[PDB]
Design an enzyme around this catalytic site. Structure first.
Site, short mmCIF file in Angstrom:
data_model
loop_
_atom_site.label_atom_id
_atom_site.label_comp_id
_atom_site.label_asym_id
_atom_site.label_seq_id
_atom_site.Cartn_x
_atom_site.Cartn_y
_atom_site.Cartn_z
N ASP A 82 0.86 -1.22 0.08
CA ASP A 82 -0.03 0.68 0.02
C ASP A 82 0.81 1.17 0.00
O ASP A 82 0.43 2.34 0.63
CB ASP A 82 -1.28 -0.27 0.96
CG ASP A 82 -2.01 0.85 0.86
OD1 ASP A 82 -2.44 0.95 1.89
OD2 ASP A 82 -2.15 1.39 -0.03
N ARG A 135 -0.52 8.83 0.95
CA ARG A 135 -0.81 9.11 2.32
C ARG A 135 -0.62 7.89 3.11
O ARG A 135 -0.19 8.19 5.07
CB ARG A 135 -2.67 8.77 2.62
CG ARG A 135 -2.30 7.27 1.63
CD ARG A 135 -4.13 6.40 2.26
NE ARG A 135 -3.87 4.79 1.04
CZ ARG A 135 -3.42 5.35 -0.69
NH1 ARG A 135 -3.59 6.14 -1.05
NH2 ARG A 135 -4.11 3.45 -0.50
N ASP A 178 3.24 1.83 7.91
CA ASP A 178 2.46 0.30 7.98
C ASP A 178 3.11 -0.41 6.89
O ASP A 178 2.03 -1.07 6.04
CB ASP A 178 0.84 1.72 7.15
CG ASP A 178 -0.40 2.27 8.16
OD1 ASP A 178 0.54 1.51 9.75
OD2 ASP A 178 -0.86 2.74 7.74
C1 LIG Z 1 -0.06 15.80 12.08
O1 LIG Z 1 -0.45 14.69 13.60
C2 LIG Z 1 -0.27 13.36 12.21
C3 LIG Z 1 0.78 13.07 12.72
C4 LIG Z 1 1.34 11.22 12.45
N1 LIG Z 1 2.48 11.06 12.94
C5 LIG Z 1 2.30 9.44 12.98
N2 LIG Z 1 3.90 9.61 13.85
C6 LIG Z 1 4.41 8.58 13.87
N3 LIG Z 1 3.36 6.60 13.69
C7 LIG Z 1 2.10 7.39 13.29
C8 LIG Z 1 1.44 6.40 12.75
C9 LIG Z 1 0.11 6.46 12.36
C10 LIG Z 1 -1.22 5.73 12.06
C11 LIG Z 1 -0.54 4.55 12.00
N4 LIG Z 1 0.36 4.08 12.63
C12 LIG Z 1 1.04 4.45 13.06
N5 LIG Z 1 2.92 4.36 13.09
C13 LIG Z 1 2.73 2.53 13.90
C14 LIG Z 1 3.62 2.11 13.24
C15 LIG Z 1 3.62 0.77 13.87
C16 LIG Z 1 3.29 0.76 14.71
C17 LIG Z 1 2.91 1.50 16.27
C18 LIG Z 1 3.00 2.99 15.54
N6 LIG Z 1 1.34 9.05 13.43
C19 LIG Z 1 -0.36 10.82 11.92
C20 LIG Z 1 -1.26 11.12 10.98
O2 LIG Z 1 -2.33 10.53 10.54
C21 LIG Z 1 -2.03 9.57 9.73
C22 LIG Z 1 -1.32 12.71 12.25
O3 LIG Z 1 -2.81 13.59 11.22
C23 LIG Z 1 -3.08 12.93 12.37
#
Ligand SMILES: COc1cc(Nc2ncnc(-c3cccnc3Nc3ccccc3)n2)cc(OC)c1OC
Length: 292
Positions: free
Chosen positions: A160, A164, A178
């Site tokens: 994927d 995004r 992801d």
């Molecule tokens: C501006 O604020 C935002 C910040 C982030 N940061 C972020 N940093 C680290 N990991 C993830 C993360 C997001 C979604 C799913 N997983 C993760 N990380 C992760 C991976 C594996 C195990 C745990 C967490 N996201 C993501 C946002 O949306 C995408 C977002 O907007 C709301």
């Protein structure tokens, strides 16, 4: 499979539950939080935490544990969202802790810079404070290519890869997210994947091509206004490709076309993409010589 049953090195990954202060949710369930001494980069740092919902099923528990084990197996790289620690022992819920990317996903960020982009700044440069430039875009591309080269080397197929799923941190550092998991996704899928359902490192390269289009269109939606139906799939298989995005360079568009080669074995490899994008980043700088 059954990665959740792989040996776990607690001495290296286990993190004290009260050294974590949970904050606001980022998505679902991922939570933003403050960590106390999780690494030698500072006493305190923000982190992302994936927590097992309470009352979750055994199957869902295995899924999250599997994700943790996969992250550990894959290893560290600057251009991927890295695992920092985990809370697995009795006394609380299962939690997986990763680096936190303050600025969110790349597609949304680029869309916010539509009126704040110029190929190259001109002196006085303060008129373009914080603007994006060709250097930024090529750099983002270069970084993701390096992150994918690493994932591919670890035998990890993303499936994927899209803007995004690229997150932005400080200092214009981007990370792929992801990748250690257990709308219109078809717009990022290679032809062989649409018709045969099998994902490979080569189909990830095709997706990378769409991601490049996303980057050089400043977060636009792939195949603008096109209905993604059987006719689309048929035409894609026949050779139809998107036209060049508004902010691309001639070399970047050709690279997009290379990644979209109908034949999987004819697409560039991520290592080749890394070498090429690095060369383009270097060549782009050679165009900006006011301060040379
Ligand atoms: C501006 O604020 C935002 C910040 C982030 N940061 C972020 N940093 C680290 N990991 C993830 C993360 C997001 C979604 C799913 N997983 C993760 N990380 C992760 C991976 C594996 C195990 C745990 C967490 N996201 C993501 C946002 O949306 C995408 C977002 O907007 C709301």
């Amino acid at each position: 499979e059954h990665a959740e049953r792989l040996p776990y090195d607690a001495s290296k990954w286990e993190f004290p539950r009260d050294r974590l202060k949970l904050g606001k949710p980022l998505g679902r369930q991922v939570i933003e939080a403050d960590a106390f001494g999780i690494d030698k980069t500072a006493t305190c740092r923000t982190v992302a935490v994936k927590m097992l919902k309470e009352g979750a099923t055994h199957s869902e528990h295995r899924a999250l544990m599997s994700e943790l084990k996969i992250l550990i197996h894959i290893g560290h790289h600057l251009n991927v969202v890295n695992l920092l620690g985990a809370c697995t022992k009795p006394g609380g819920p299962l939690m997986v802790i990763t680096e936190f990317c303050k600025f969110g996903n790349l597609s949304t960020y680029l869309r916010s810079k539509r009126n704040e982009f110029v190929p190259y700044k001109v002196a006085p440069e303060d008129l373009y404070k914080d603007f994006l430039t060709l250097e930024h875009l090529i750099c983002y591309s270069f970084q993701v290519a390096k992150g994918m080269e690493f994932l591919a080397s670890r035998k990890c197929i993303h499936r994927d890869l899209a803007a995004r799923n690229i997150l932005l941190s400080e200092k214009n550092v981007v990370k792929i997210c992801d990748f250690g998991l257990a709308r219109l996704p078809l717009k990022w899928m290679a032809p062989e994947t649409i018709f045969d359902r099998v994902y490979t490192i080569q189909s990830d390269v095709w997706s990378f091509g769409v991601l490049l289009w996303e980057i050089f269109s400043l977060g636009a939606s792939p195949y603008p206004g096109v209905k993604i139906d059987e006719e689309f799939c048929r035409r894609l298989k026949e050779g139809t490709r998107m036209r060049a995005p508004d902010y691309t360079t001639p070399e970047m568009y050709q690279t997009m076309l290379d990644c979209w080669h109908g034949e999987p074995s004819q697409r560039p490899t991520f290592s080749e993409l890394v070498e090429h994008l690095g060369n383009l980043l270097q060549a782009n700088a050679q165009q900006d010589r006011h301060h040379h």
